[PDB]
Design an enzyme around this catalytic site. Structure first.
Site, PDB file in Angstrom:
ATOM      1  N   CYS B 116       0.832  -1.191   0.000  1.00 47.39           N
ATOM      2  CA  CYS B 116       0.000   0.000   0.000  1.00 47.39           C
ATOM      3  C   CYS B 116       0.872   1.249   0.000  1.00 47.39           C
ATOM      4  O   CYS B 116       2.010   1.240   0.474  1.00 47.39           O
ATOM      5  CB  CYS B 116      -0.928   0.007   1.213  1.00 47.39           C
ATOM      6  SG  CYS B 116      -2.136   1.347   1.223  1.00 47.39           S
ATOM      7  N   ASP B 118       0.639   3.638   1.824  1.00 46.70           N
ATOM      8  CA  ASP B 118       0.681   4.232   3.151  1.00 46.70           C
ATOM      9  C   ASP B 118       2.119   4.516   3.561  1.00 46.70           C
ATOM     10  O   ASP B 118       3.025   3.720   3.303  1.00 46.70           O
ATOM     11  CB  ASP B 118       0.019   3.299   4.163  1.00 46.70           C
ATOM     12  CG  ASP B 118      -0.478   4.030   5.388  1.00 46.70           C
ATOM     13  OD1 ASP B 118      -1.542   4.675   5.305  1.00 46.70           O
ATOM     14  OD2 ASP B 118       0.192   3.957   6.437  1.00 46.70           O
ATOM     15  N   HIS B 185      -2.100  -3.651   5.173  1.00 48.67           N
ATOM     16  CA  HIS B 185      -1.713  -3.224   6.507  1.00 48.67           C
ATOM     17  C   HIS B 185      -2.946  -3.068   7.381  1.00 48.67           C
ATOM     18  O   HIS B 185      -4.058  -2.844   6.899  1.00 48.67           O
ATOM     19  CB  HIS B 185      -0.913  -1.918   6.472  1.00 48.67           C
ATOM     20  CG  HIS B 185      -1.655  -0.770   5.870  1.00 48.67           C
ATOM     21  ND1 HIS B 185      -2.115   0.291   6.617  1.00 48.67           N
ATOM     22  CD2 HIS B 185      -2.015  -0.514   4.591  1.00 48.67           C
ATOM     23  CE1 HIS B 185      -2.726   1.152   5.825  1.00 48.67           C
ATOM     24  NE2 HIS B 185      -2.681   0.687   4.590  1.00 48.67           N
ATOM     25  N   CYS B 196      -6.270   0.709   6.763  1.00 48.09           N
ATOM     26  CA  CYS B 196      -6.084   1.184   5.397  1.00 48.09           C
ATOM     27  C   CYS B 196      -7.168   2.200   5.070  1.00 48.09           C
ATOM     28  O   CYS B 196      -8.345   1.848   4.955  1.00 48.09           O
ATOM     29  CB  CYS B 196      -6.114   0.017   4.417  1.00 48.09           C
ATOM     30  SG  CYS B 196      -5.342   0.374   2.826  1.00 48.09           S
TER      31      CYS B 196
HETATM   32 ZN   LIG Z   1      -3.624   1.899   2.884  1.00 47.98          ZN
END
Ligand SMILES: [Zn+2]
Ligand SMILES: [Zn+2]
EC number: 4.2.1.1
Lengths: 457, 457
Positions: B116, B118, B185, B196
């Site tokens: 991801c 992130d 995650h 997420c």
């Molecule tokens: Zn995410």
């Protein structure tokens, strides 16, 4: 005005019939609109308009286009947009192995043609070159023949992988190459105004730009892969006034000279009164003399047998197109046909079913942000073409998707709607006046796949 | 609080030192700005600010940033932008075969990780997985692990072609596969707010989205190519609070179960007091019991030797990261570190030199039009993070280019400037207040290539 012995008469008649039918379908809309504007908005307006549309365009119109016209005035712009979309749909629906063998015999497992995005080059494959679109023939048109190196490299890698794994065209050990053809255009009658607009109508500028792009692609293929991987390059120029090609003959190593070429106009002139076999002998030797010429055309060695055979077949095919133009327009296109005469703006991947000269302005783009200049050029062209007469600009956003990849169709539809919205927010003044009409369509990447309309929202 | 026998102590110290140095370089700017704001705009303003900057940030400032501050007020925003850009440059400059063999022994010729976007997953490779970035290891981060199928397919085709032509990783006849890893995650402490954000902080939603994307990619590879071409898929979940991974073990055929997985938290708990060899035995059998478990984890057969060895190595590597987090933060990240704590917005291909947890917000995009939502999400995050304190938002537009392709660098620079202008015209209110600071950089695609700054205009 006699006929060339090598002309394909029935193919010429068939092509002319298709061109006439499609252009008539697109052009008959305006007289119908002018007749409609004279119908009073009484209680019989809807019925009269519907019966007139059925008699003229062969189809009716949605009532929403005419239901509230009595209070909002004639909806001529909406009817124009709908009729143009219907004409495009009718043209595509009406349109809807040997070539691979011929390519293999000439030493190529794939042919990639990248002409200019000019509308006058739209019918390059079915008319000028007489080359059918096959599973190994690709047509990626870019403005000024400025084709993108990265996607061409990706296509080359995909084709080579297919050869290595399955050998669909042929096995990998065969000494065939990937052929990339770049096509530029020029005007004999009006060189300074009817040339490539991407290069300021400068013939030599377009020639050198196409040659530089071909050289860059060849060197990128050579650098990206080892074991002496390479490609073959071909350069073709098209005279949009007579649809005649000059083919730049590569030397023994494949390099191209802007001055070493065979022109098909003089070939047609000097082969007009001979016989088929003699004309074939003539073009076969003419390729050799042009490739062996010295001076500015100094080249190292002679082109291979496959290259020369391919170029000879191309010239023979273009002879039929030259004869077709001579028959239909007396040797040169009419002055209205020399310049811009497009009917709509094609945005996206274009249509493989309406490859007709000067039918649409094509803007190869996946994002308005990346290639806004193509959209501005098209809008500027249609401002003189259509907005001068008060008609709206019709735009067909068409895209191709791969059904094998999951979720590809939905992503393509999202992309089409995004492009439509981006073109909407730009030229918002034209949008508020209903001067932009849109139709959004998707199609599977396979040849002959049906075209599916999608809603604008 | 004892140390795990398998922990890599010196590697943990080295990683902690780098993380601390980079974060300090980014964070020391604000106190310097606060000190600067108290300096009177007299005749000694420029000299005092320059000497203070040299003493604090280790570098001076351009005079244009301070020349006209006496009449235009303190240029705190410009100094902030310049200092943040200098900090990023310093971090990248300070950062600037065995892995391939290990992958080959496990039966893979290429590893592709798609975590991801992130920021908490930024240091996934050097910290969480301890996997170096090699010529055959790729990291393509997307929002919500929603990686694009088409580019992955193109990369697979390129790698397979390289294997067939030169066999750089290995010859094509070797029974190795292409490994695609998807990382999602979740947050144990705050599942409903620190999950997420692309899936509304829903753990199972992120899990099923990643699994669906992996399945789609596998089926697309199978459909696009014949002769039974296929790939291997792996699914990993990361607990951002403790940097612990749960690896979903594939069955004999490679299918993944959202419930059949090995969790490294319980593994660390149950292997803490044993000895290295015994712990290795434990994780080797634990993979087997998890893969042979029944109920919701019902799987057909057992995973191959290479798959199990790779997963065991991954778990052993993640043990060191778990120990690192335990040492540095007492078993869990501080509450400020649990959520968003990014320092700048990374737009483009990102930096491979600053892979540090929660350092930057990454927006993988080539066009603002295509992925505007990532830019809006980043601006919303930094509105609370930075705009609340009155500081401007720093944005690093970084892109990679291939020097082999001619004209690639110029096209990349044009793309960077286009992205910068597009982000400028959006959020124009923030632009007018000088609340957006930019730095544009390009880099060759080769690992370790220098980063070149480019002018915004
Ligand atoms: Zn995410
Ligand atoms: Zn042109």
């Amino acid at each position: 005005t006699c006929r060339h012995p090598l002309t394909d008469l029935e193919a010429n008649e068939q092509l002319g019939r298709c061109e006439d039918s499609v252009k008539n379908r697109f052009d008959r809309v305006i007289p119908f609109l002018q007749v409609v504007a004279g119908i009073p908005l009484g209680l019989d307006y809807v019925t009269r308009v519907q019966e007139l549309a059925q008699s003229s365009l062969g189809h009716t119109l949605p009532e929403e286009l005419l239901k509230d016209n009595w209070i909002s005035g004639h909806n001529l712009k909406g009817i124009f947009g709908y009729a143009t979309a219907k004409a495009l749909t009718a043209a595509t629906e009406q349109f809807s192995a040997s070539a691979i063998g011929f390519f293999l015999d000439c030493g190529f497992h794939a042919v990639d043609i990248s002409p200019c995005a000019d509308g006058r080059l739209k019918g390059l494959l079915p008319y000028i070159l007489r080359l059918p679109l096959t599973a190994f023939t690709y047509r990626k048109a870019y403005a000024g023949s400025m084709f993108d190196i990265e996607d061409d490299l990706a296509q080359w890698e995909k084709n080579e992988l297919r050869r290595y794994r399955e050998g669909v065209p042929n096995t990998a050990d065969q000494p065939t190459r990937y052929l990339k053809i770049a096509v530029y255009h020029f005007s004999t009658s009006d060189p300074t105004h009817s040339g490539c607009a991407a290069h300021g109508s400068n013939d030599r500028a377009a020639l050198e730009a196409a040659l530089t792009q071909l050289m860059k692609f060849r060197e990128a293929v050579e650098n990206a892969h080892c074991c002496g991987a390479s490609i073959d390059i071909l350069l073709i120029g098209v005279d949009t006034d007579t649809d005649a090609i000059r083919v730049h003959i590569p030397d023994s190593k494949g390099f191209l000279n802007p001055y070493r070429y065979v022109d098909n106009t003089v070939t047609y002139a000097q082969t007009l009164h001979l016989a088929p076999d003699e004309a074939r002998v003539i073009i076969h030797e003419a390729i050799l003399n042009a490739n062996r010429s010295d001076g500015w055309a100094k080249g190292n060695g002679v082109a291979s047998e496959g290259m020369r055979r391919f170029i000879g077949q191309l010239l023979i095919n273009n002879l039929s197109q030259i004869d077709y133009v001579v028959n239909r327009h007396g040797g040169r296109y009419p002055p209205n046909d020399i310049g811009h005469a497009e009917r709509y703006i094609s945005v996206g991947d274009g249509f493989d079913e309406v490859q007709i000269r000067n039918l649409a302005y094509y803007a190869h783009l996946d994002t308005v942000e990346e290639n806004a200049i193509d959209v501005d050029v098209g809008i500027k062209i249609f401002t003189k073409l259509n907005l001068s007469r008060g008609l709206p600009i019709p735009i067909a956003i068409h895209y191709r998707y791969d059904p094998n990849v999951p979720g590809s169709r939905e992503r393509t539809v999202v992309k089409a709607r995004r492009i439509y919205n981006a073109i909407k927010e730009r030229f918002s003044s034209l949008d508020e006046q209903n001067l932009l009409q849109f139709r959004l369509s998707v199609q599977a990447q396979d040849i002959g796949s049906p075209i599916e309309e999608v809603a604008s929202a």
